[PDB]
A paper describes a structure:
Protein tyrosine phosphorylation regulates the production of capsular polysaccharide, an essential virulence factor of the deadly pathogen [name]. The process requires the protein tyrosine kinase Wzc and its cognate phosphatase [name], both of which are largely uncharacterized. VvWzb belongs to the low-molecular-weight protein tyrosine phosphatase (LMWPTP) family. Interestingly, it contains an extra four-residue insertion in the W-loop, distinct from all known LMWPTPs.
VvWzb crystallized in the space group P212121, with two protein molecules in one asymmetric unit. The two molecules formed a dimer in the crystal, with an interface area of about 900 Å2. However, this seems to be a crystallographic dimer, since VvWzb existed as a monomer in solution, indicated by gel filtration. VvWzb adopts a typical LMWPTP α/β fold. The W-loop of VvWzb, which is longer than any known LMWPTP by harboring a four-residue insert (40EKSR43), bulges out, with residues Ser42, Arg43, and Leu44 located at the tip region and residue Glu40 pointing toward the active site. In such a configuration, the active site crevice of free VvWzb is wide and shallow, being readily accessible for the substrate. Due to the presence of Glu40, the W-loop wall region of the crevice is negatively charged. In the absence of ligand, the supposed phosphate-binding site is occupied by a chloride ion and a few water molecules; they interact with the P- and D-loop residues via extensive hydrogen bonding.
Author numbering: -1 to 146
Write the structure that this text describes.
Amino acid sequence: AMGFNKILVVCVGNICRSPTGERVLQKLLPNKTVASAGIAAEKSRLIGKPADAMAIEVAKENCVDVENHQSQQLTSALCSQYDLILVMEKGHMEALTQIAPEARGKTMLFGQWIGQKDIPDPYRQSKEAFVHAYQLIDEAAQAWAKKL
Ligand SMILES: [Cl-]
């Protein structure tokens, strides 16, 4: 009914949380187009980095494919192509507003339907941190799927 067909999942690096969230939500909603971007996307010179090796490993154990990901920079042009934008932290909303002020009105929280929780960043931590990040992303995505 809302027409949220193209969904953009956003974090800072676009290598841990947002590619995980993108692929978990994509598996739950096969007829939707789910992509991801970073407020300060991690790049190798100018090439988009793949998802963190541990993020790929943890998702693989939960039957979610996070291979063939290339990080991309969040821009106003990119935001204009999506119907719904889902940030990983409430704090990300201020930075997103500076890049894409026209995206105000379609920027929502990834963990909105799980008590408005921020998804913990597992970057540079052990496998267990990647497990907890995945588990909370899964709970949040399942709650979004019932509303989409
Ligand atoms: Cl991040």
